[PDB]
Amino acid sequence: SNYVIQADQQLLDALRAHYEGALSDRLPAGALFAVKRPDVVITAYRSGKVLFQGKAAEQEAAKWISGASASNETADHQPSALAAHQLGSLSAIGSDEVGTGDYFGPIVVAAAYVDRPHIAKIAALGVKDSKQLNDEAIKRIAPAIMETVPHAVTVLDNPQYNRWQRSGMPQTKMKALLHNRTLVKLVDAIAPAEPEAIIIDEFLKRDSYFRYLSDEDRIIRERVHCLPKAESVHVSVAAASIIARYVFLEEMEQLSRAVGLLLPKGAGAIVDEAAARIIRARGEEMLETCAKLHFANTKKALAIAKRR
Numbered sequence: 033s034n035y036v037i038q039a040d041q042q043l044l045d046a047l048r049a050h051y052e053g054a055l056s057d058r059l060p061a062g063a064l065f066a067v068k069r070p071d072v073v074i075t076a077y078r079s080g081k082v083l084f085q086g087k088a089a090e091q092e093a094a095k096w097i098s099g100a101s102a103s104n105e106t107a108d109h110q111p112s113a114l115a116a117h118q119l120g121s122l123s124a125i126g127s128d129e130v131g132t133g134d135y136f137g138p139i140v141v142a143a144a145y146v147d148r149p150h151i152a153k154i155a156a157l158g159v160k161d162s163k164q165l166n167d168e169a170i171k172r173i174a175p176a177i178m179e180t181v182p183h184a185v186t187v188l189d190n191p192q193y194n195r196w197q198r199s200g201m202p203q204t205k206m207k208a209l210l211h212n213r214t215l216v217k218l219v220d221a222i223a224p225a226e227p228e229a230i231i232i233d234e235f236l237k238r239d240s241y242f243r244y245l246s247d248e249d250r251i252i253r254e255r256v257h258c259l260p261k262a263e264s265v266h267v268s269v270a271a272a273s274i275i276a277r278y279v280f281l282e283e284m285e286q287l288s289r290a291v292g293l294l295l296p297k298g299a300g301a302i303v304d305e306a307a308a309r310i311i312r313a314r315g316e317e318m319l320e321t322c323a324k325l326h327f328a329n330t331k332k333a334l335a336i337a338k339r340r
């Protein structure tokens with residue numbers, strides 16, 4: 033009976049550093065490293081899962097964790113990593129959006145093309161876990177990325193957003209249209225070059241995605257991969273997220289200036305108050321130029337406006 037355990041980042045680092053001569057070439061999908069230890073083979077995965085196989089498996093496992101669970105699991109590929117393992121090193125276009133949940137502002141979709149020779153460079157900019165990066169880091173990293181790799185962006189401003197919405201087009205359909213159009217722009221811009229893969233950070237079922245594009249004049253379908261948390265699959269997606277956020281911030285600064293009031297992000301109470309201030313100082317119609325009207329925030333702001 034081989035043994036498996038769950039190791040945190042500290043444990044993973046200790047394991048890798050401990051065993052001198054750790055192997056990292058030609059390993060199963062998801063595996064970080066393997067140890068050709070005598071009487072026991074150790075394989076550590078991205079998920080933190082570490083497997084001990086061999087005669088002295090239980091013994092080796094005990095050296096790191098107490099009460100190591102035994103299982104029949106083998107050092108095989110991890111389904112969660114099958115995609116990253118194959119797409120990670122390819123030249124690819126990655127796309128993602130921002131602003132969907134923000135009462136104020138547009139929806140921004142960006143796509144970045146990272147050719148094989150630029151993968152390391154973009155990754156060195158610390159694009160991984162872009163979710164952890166604050167706005168100031170975005171303003172710092174985005175420009176570097178835009179300067180290194182080709183990209184495209186499609187900004188859905190509030191007046192157009194509101195028009196599509198009141199017409200019956202839900203956000204899901206809006207996003208599908210924006211991704212497709214942004215992808216079309218990047219594909220033509222990098223031609224004659226062609227990406228080995230096109231990865232869309234999943235926001236809805238593939239089947240539903242293309243159905244929404246049935247009326248589009250041009251549809252990017254070819255080597256399109258719809259994957260969840262795509263940022264962990266390819267640096268191009270992470271790059272897209274950062275660019276999208278950078279543009280969103282830039283749009284918000286411009287929008288706040290046009291409105292004459294600082295527009296907070298999100299859709300909390302502070303947004304309700306801000307919307308109330310806008311109505312009183314500029315008129316309710318001003319919201320049509322800077323907010324996603326159908327949001328519940330509109331009703332709340334109008335109430336606060338008359339309440340004062």
Ligand SMILES: [Mg+2]
Binds near residue numbers: 128233234
């Ligand atoms: Mg997304």
